[PDB]
TrEMBL record, chain B:
Species whose genome carries this gene: Entamoeba histolytica (strain ATCC 30459 / HM-1:IMSS / ABRM)
Protein name per the record: 60S ribosomal protein L9, putative
Keywords (A to Z) from UniProt: Ribonucleoprotein, Ribosomal protein
GO CC terms in record: cytosolic large ribosomal subunit
Family to which this protein belongs: Belongs to the universal ribosomal protein uL6 family.
NCBIfam families in alphabetical order: PRK05518.1
Example of a GO MF term: structural constituent of ribosome
Statement: the UniProt record of this protein carries the keyword Ribosomal protein: yes
Stored InterPro entries: Ribosomal_uL6-like, Ribosomal_uL6-like_a/b-dom_sf, Ribosomal_uL6_a/b-dom
Pfam families listed in its UniProt record: Ribosomal_L6 (PF00347)
Domain Large ribosomal subunit protein uL6 alpha-beta: 12-94, 117-183
Automatic annotation (TrEMBL), chain C:
Biological process terms in GO annotation: cytoplasmic translation
GO molecular function, one term: structural constituent of ribosome
Transcription among keywords: no
Record's keyword annotation contains Lipid metabolism: no
A single GO cellular-component term on record: cytosolic large ribosomal subunit
UniProt superkingdom: Eukaryota
All copies of domain Large ribosomal subunit protein eL20, residue ranges: 1-122
Name by which UniProt lists this protein: 60S ribosomal protein L18a
Family to which this protein belongs: Belongs to the eukaryotic ribosomal protein eL20 family.
Pfam assignment, any one: Ribosomal_L18A
Record keywords: Ribonucleoprotein, Ribosomal protein
UniProtKB/TrEMBL annotation, chain D:
InterPro entries per record: Ribosomal_uL13, Ribosomal_uL13_euk/arc, Ribosomal_uL13_sf
Keywords of the record: Ribonucleoprotein, Ribosomal protein
GO molecular function per UniProt: mRNA binding; structural constituent of ribosome
Pfam families named in the record: Ribosomal_L13 (PF00572)
Family: Belongs to the universal ribosomal protein uL13 family.
Protein name: 60S ribosomal protein L13, putative
GO process terms (BP): negative regulation of translation; translation
Tree of life domain: Eukaryota
NCBIfam families linked to this entry: L13_A_E (TIGR01077)
Source organism: Entamoeba histolytica (strain ATCC 30459 / HM-1:IMSS / ABRM)
UniProt KW Transcription regulation keyword: no
GO cellular component entries: cytosolic large ribosomal subunit; ribosome
TrEMBL record, chain F:
Signal peptide interval: none
Protein family: Belongs to the universal ribosomal protein uL3 family.
Organism: Entamoeba histolytica (strain ATCC 30459 / HM-1:IMSS / ABRM)
Identification of the protein by name: 60S ribosomal protein L3, putative
Keyword annotations from UniProtKB, A to Z: Ribonucleoprotein, Ribosomal protein
Length: 106, 193, 173, 204, 130, 251
RNA sequence: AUAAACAUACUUUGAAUCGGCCAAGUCUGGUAAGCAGGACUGGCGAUGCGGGAUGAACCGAACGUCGAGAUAAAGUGCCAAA
RNA sequence: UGUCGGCUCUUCCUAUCCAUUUCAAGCAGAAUUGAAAAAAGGUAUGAUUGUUCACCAUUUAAUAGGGAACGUGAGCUGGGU
RNA sequence: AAUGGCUGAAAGCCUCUCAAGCCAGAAUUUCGUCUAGAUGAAUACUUUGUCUUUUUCUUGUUACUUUAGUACAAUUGAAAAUUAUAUACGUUGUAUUUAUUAUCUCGUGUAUUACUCUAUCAAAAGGGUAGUGAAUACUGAGUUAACAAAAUUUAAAGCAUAA
């Protein structure tokens, strides 16, 4: 109906050269090209909506979501840190997430 | 050191028309036309009116300009100016390269095609192989006297290379070149008019 | 780079305590400036920290940091061969500004790190006294040149998109 | 959402390595890339130097079985795939999937010839190169090493330029009439209320 | 020949920094990379400072009778004498500066109005041409 | 250490791997380079080897010391009955090689050609080219054929004729034909298609393709030998008689 | 001057060990050795962790199970976080 | 971890013996000598010795020097050790 | 390639270029040619025309049989070249994902289209002509929404006939 979100790319987890900490996920919000535009998005909602091909004998929904929040910037290029209720599956790397306009402060 | 500005100019005589299109100079004179390309990414070529004599009036010139640039790049300004000066001279008083055939024992016969676009050197040092030596476009060979020819044309680069191609084809091999003074040599290079 | 005005006195048997040493030291801060002052005193007057007292370490600020001046620097540096005395000229508006240029230039052309260069003195010369082959072309009144091959300028990092749209072009500015 | 549209990169007047580095990073970010005219990319060094590098590259080869050895592709569309594949993860599903969304063609083929082309400013040869530095088109180097289809491409590109010449001329005629027709609506008095709104915000 | 030159008196526009999209006047050329812009602080608010040439853009105007090392008092006299402010706003880049200022204070309602209005006008102009 | 004495390697590395072919017929890897300044003509044929005889030929070269009465030489006899041209195909030059655009066939096709498209003919329904022949003269199909001709004339560079043999004229027990594409080298693509269309359903004899005292190239599959050792395959030196475990191998 | 009460002084009984190896603003024999032998200290052995692509010794720093932050050596075109 | 040489066979290096292209000479010609590009192709037959090595007799355009666990023993031989 | 040269500055002369630009030059390199060969293309016949999964027949494959589920024509995506760019302007300052004013009905014709479809001429075309519908502009008027719901993306079973 209407677009009320900004597409964000799940680049990967907060890691080191030979380590990886899947508790914090890194996102690239479309339109943020510097760390001085991130303060708007600190605290906004983020959802990882995905589709599962359920069977006709299951009541499990075909559309599910994992929700989280943006907590801090990550480097001088407008990359963010997002903490989710359940850590995103690494099979979802490079996929698109939703950055909502709420909880609004405007 | 880097020169802030290096510039050169070439005076355009009356019977010469010059037009420039992105470092591409076409010169038209009484003897014809001559189009050359100068693909240096740091040189600006434009025609203006300048006073070059110490007390003379204004005149049409072509200005070759290179701004801030090291001494390796700066040297190309006078190279391009010489080429444009050569082209202006070429279409006004074309170039001619007089060569003389030198032999010790075996006479050499030169066979020139009717159109003058090719030559043929025969019996050079008694060799049964006959040299052909094609000529570049716009260069014509003719026979002045005995054992002497001359190449005419508008482009000095084409006339000089074609003359050198004749000499390069008649080199003595596996012999004392200090003793076997043979071949065709450029006696002098001069203008037709 | 900052300039400092440092003074001290020596209280011992060898040096009478009525002689005050002054200097102007260029250093990133006052701690480094004092170190350059104490070593200058020790290597030239046998004065050591444990037998001397520091008095002033106030900074020196440029009086008119809006006037373009041709600075001349007399320095000595140490190379693989030996020790040499050099004289370089720079065009800047502050004394500490020209010294920043001197240190960067020396480390580039001569591959000399900062801890081999001693700045003897820095002065100001006239327009026609600049003998630098490149810098002599800008001291005149009628300098003029077009900056060609300009890369288009970005206002800020906000508009620094990775992939652009359409063709690209330089500027004749 | 899902990125189904394809980013088209016109590889004309770009650097081979700097295009690959930007393309390789964004392949991992889920984007879909199609680099057309991958034969017009430029590399540093004259043709003689490029051949020395190529001849050194051709040396690496399995002694006991050259058919197992390094395969030295000579097509420029394969000189960019090799460059991109070097910058992508090796021996995992993440690397294979990222490379699955990449294509070079030696020209603009049928579906990608009428698509919105993009450019990579970091990889432009006019920014990262001293103009005096001599370069080499990947197509010219390909011919010198044994790429047979260099003149087939030059025929196809020539017919693409001439077909886009008539489309552009017809489009410029229509767009001029549409622009002049709009100026009559702007000057019209019935649309005065709407025009004032546009003038207020500078759109007119 | 090149049209716009980096010289003394040339009017330049600061493309980045705290004074982005503000006019300035060159009054001294330190070297090939640095110039001293004193775009009159009393008029355009640009202080006398040294800037790198990678942060400015040349315009088509040169202030007449501006010499190297001009004082702020004399420079302001020549800046208003040549009427640089009026001439700059008539140029293509001057209008684009105003449009950027115009569009940044556009609320969602204002954007809604113009987006709806422009769609009809552009459609209407397309219909007119046969 | 270095080998004590030097000798050329045994066997050519230009014919590696030594893989036996699958079809008796051998396809030419290329045709002579096209020249657009001559009349269209065929650049190949196909024949069956018969045997070998010897001939005494009179020497016509000069400045040679050969006997004046004639030189004994071997010859090979290749029986070449006429071919039947049953179609043609145009190839376009792309960035991955020649690509066949369309193939246009004749109305009448012999069962020798139809036998190529099955693997058990005696059990087949033998309905090859049935729809192509039955609907050859319909208005819809005629328009389609006219488009194939014009498509080739517009977007093609190489034209070849699909000519097949007649195996009822040779003593071979095989009945299915031997199809071969013979490129047409000659004028422009316009007159190449015109010549190719004229050859449809016709017969081409070897005298039209080749001249007299003409040097040609022959491509064929050699005589099979089976599993062979290194001595026969490459020509290595047999080992001394004293050798344990065998003599005819590489040490 | 500074530190020191889970400080200090120990007594008794006993285990394993005395093949060592490395570094160096060190030395001796040797042309020299990833050679042989020494003075002082720190390590490896007995030791994982972050970095140097990989490595017994190099640099940072020594380890109960976890969460959040500021860091160290060292790095920020892609593989690879910047 | 089967320890010499020879036999068979493949490959690699160039610090090139020949063939190809060049420059130099105290290169008149012929025969030569020094040097550069170049390792894609060739570089032998025998008397004596287990020999590597060596020395002789020929032939050749040349009869170059080396590595690959001092290449190669479920590949041979067993002459030496 | 080694090397011999041409024009030619740097450096007013000279210079084969630790300069731009060219020529001649090897048992050299690459095309051409020979061998093996991946993804492929054309044609002939059998089919299918929204689609799959699991069973199941066959030496095997395709078409095929049954029970269900799902979508239903209509705004997508192109200047080229150059960058010391004929002049002028610098047209500044957010690429894809991601630019439609909720819903249905009612009203008048015109106009427009890289729109859908039909017929036709052509065609390895964001093609031509004629007609038809769609959307939009001129440009309306009215209905309804309150709690619930606004998703396919493919799951299960068989072998009569034909190639």
């Amino acid at each position: 109906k209407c677009r009320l979100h900004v597409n964000a790319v799940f680049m990967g987890f907060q890691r080191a050269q030979r380590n990886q900490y899947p508790n914090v996920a890194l996102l690239q919000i479309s339109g943020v090209n510097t760390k001085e535009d991130t303060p708007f998005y600190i605290g906004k909602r983020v959802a990882y909506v995905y589709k599962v091909n359920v069977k006709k004998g299951s009541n499990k929904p075909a559309i599910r979501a994992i929700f989280g929040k943006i907590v801090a910037p990550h480097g001088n290029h407008g990359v963010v840190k997002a903490r989710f209720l359940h850590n995103l599956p690494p099979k979802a790397m490079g996929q698109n997430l939703k950055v909502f306009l709420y909880p609004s402060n405007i | 050191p880097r020169l802030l500005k290096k510039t050169e100019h070439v005076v355009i005589p009356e019977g010469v028309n010059i037009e420039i299109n992105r470092k591409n100079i076409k010169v038209t004179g009484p003897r014809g036309s001559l189009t050359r390309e100068f693909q240096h990414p740091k040189v600006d070529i434009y025609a203006s009116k300048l006073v070059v004599k110490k007390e003379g009036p204004k005149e049409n010139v072509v200005v070759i300009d290179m701004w801030y640039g090291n001494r390796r790049d700066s040297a190309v300004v006078r190279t391009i100016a010489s080429h444009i000066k050569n082209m202006i001279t070429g279409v006004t008083k074309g170039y001619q390269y007089k060569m003389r055939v030198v032999y010790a024992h075996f006479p050499v016969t030169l066979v020139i095609a009717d159109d003058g676009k090719s030559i043929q050197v025969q019996n050079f040092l008694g060799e049964k192989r006959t040299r052909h030596i094609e000529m570049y476009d716009g260069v014509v060979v003719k026979k002045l006297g005995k054992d002497e020819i001359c190449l005419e044309g508008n482009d000095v680069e084409k006339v000089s290379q074609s003359a050198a191609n004749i000499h390069a084809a008649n080199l003595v091999r596996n012999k004392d070149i200090r003793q076997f003074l043979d071949g065709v040599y450029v006696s002098e290079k001069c203008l037709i008019e | 780079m900052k300039e400092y005005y440092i003074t001290a006195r020596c209280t011992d048997k060898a040096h009478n305590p009525n002689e005050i040493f002054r200097s102007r030291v260029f250093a990133p801060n006052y701690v480094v400036a004092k170190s350059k002052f104490w070593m200058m005193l020790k290597k030239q007057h046998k004065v050591k920290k444990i037998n001397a007292e520091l008095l002033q370490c106030q900074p020196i600020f440029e009086k008119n940091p809006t006037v373009v001046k041709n600075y001349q620097i007399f320095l000595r540096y140490v190379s693989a061969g030996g020790i040499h005395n050099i004289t370089k000229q720079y065009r800047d508006v502050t004394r500490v500004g020209a010294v920043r240029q001197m240190y960067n230039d020396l480390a580039s052309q001569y591959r000399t790190r900062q801890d081999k260069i001693q700045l003897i003195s820095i002065t100001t010369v006239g327009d026609k006294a600049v003998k630098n082959p490149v810098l002599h072309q800008f001291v005149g009144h009628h300098v003029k040149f077009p900056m060609v091959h300009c890369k288009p300028v970005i206002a800020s990092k906000r508009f620094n998109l990775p992939i652009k749209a359409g063709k690209l072009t330089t500027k004749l500015c | 959402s899902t990125n189904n549209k394809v980013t088209v990169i016109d590889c004309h007047g770009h650097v081979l390595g700097r295009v690959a580095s930007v393309v390789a990073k964004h392949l991992l970010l889920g984007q879909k890339f199609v680099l057309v005219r991958c034969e017009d990319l430029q590399v540093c060094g004259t043709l003689k130097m490029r051949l020395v590098q190529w001849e050194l590259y051709q040396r690496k080869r399995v002694n006991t079985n050259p058919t197992r050895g390094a395969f030295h592709h000579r097509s420029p569309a394969d000189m960019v795939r090799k460059a991109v594949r070097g910058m992508l993860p090796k021996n995992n599903y993440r690397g294979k999937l990222a490379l699955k969304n990449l294509k070079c063609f030696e020209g603009c083929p049928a579906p990608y010839d009428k698509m919105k082309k993009s450019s990579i400013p970091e990889a432009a040869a006019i920014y990262s190169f001293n103009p005096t530095r001599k370069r080499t088109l990947l197509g010219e180097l390909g011919t010198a090493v044994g790429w047979k289809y260099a003149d087939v491409v030059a025929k196809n590109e020539a017919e693409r330029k001439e077909r886009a010449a008539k489309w552009y001329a017809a489009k410029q005629l229509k767009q001029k009439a549409v622009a002049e027709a709009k100026e009559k609506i702007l000057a019209d008095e019935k649309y005065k209320a709407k025009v004032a709104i546009l003038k207020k915000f500078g759109y007119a | 020949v090149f049209s716009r030159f980096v010289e003394v008196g040339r009017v330049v526009l600061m493309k980045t920094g705290p004074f982005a999209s503000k006019l300035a006047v060159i009054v001294e050329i330190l070297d090939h990379n640095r110039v001293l812009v004193d775009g009159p602080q009393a008029i355009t608010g640009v202080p006398r400072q040294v800037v790198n040439l990678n942060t400015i853009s040349l315009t088509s105007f040169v202030v007449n009778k501006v010499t190297r090392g001009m004082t702020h008092k004399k420079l302001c006299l020549r800046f208003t004498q040549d009427a640089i402010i009026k001439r700059f706003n008539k140029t293509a880049t001057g209008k684009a500066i105003e449009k950027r200022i115009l569009r940044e204070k556009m609320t969602d309602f204002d954007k809604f109005q113009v987006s709806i209005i422009n769609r009809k006008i552009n459609a209407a102009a397309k219909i007119a041409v046969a | 250490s270095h080998r004590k004495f030097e000798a050329p390697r045994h066997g050519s590395l230009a014919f590696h791997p030594r893989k036996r072919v699958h079809k008796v017929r051998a396809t030419v890897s290329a045709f002579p380079k096209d020249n657009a300044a001559e009349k269209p003509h065929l650049t190949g044929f196909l024949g069956f080897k018969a045997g070998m005889t010897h001939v005494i030929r009179e020497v016509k070269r000069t400045n040679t010391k050969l006997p004046k009465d004639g030189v004994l030489e071997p010859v090979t006899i290749i029986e070449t009955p006429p071919m039947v041209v049953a179609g043609f195909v145009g190839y376009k030059k792309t960035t991955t090689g020649l690509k066949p655009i369309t193939a246009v066939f004749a109305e009448h096709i012999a069962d020798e050609f139809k036998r190529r498209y099955t693997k058990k003919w005696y059990k087949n329904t033998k309905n090859q080219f049935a729809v192509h022949t039955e609907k050859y003269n319909d208005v819809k199909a005629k328009s389609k054929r006219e488009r194939q001709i014009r498509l080739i004339k517009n977007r093609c560079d190489v034209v070849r004729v699909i000519a097949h043999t007649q195996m009822a004229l040779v003593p071979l027990k095989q009945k299915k034909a031997e199809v071969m594409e013979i490129q047409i080298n000659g004028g422009s693509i316009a007159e190449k298609v015109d010549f190719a269309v004229s050859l449809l359903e016709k017969q081409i004899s070897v005298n039209s393709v080749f001249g007299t005292d003409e040097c040609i190239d022959v491509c064929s599959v050699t005589k099979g030998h089976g599993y062979n050792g290194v001595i026969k395959r490459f020509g290595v030196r047999h080992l001394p008689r004293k050798t344990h475990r065998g003599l005819r191998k590489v040490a």
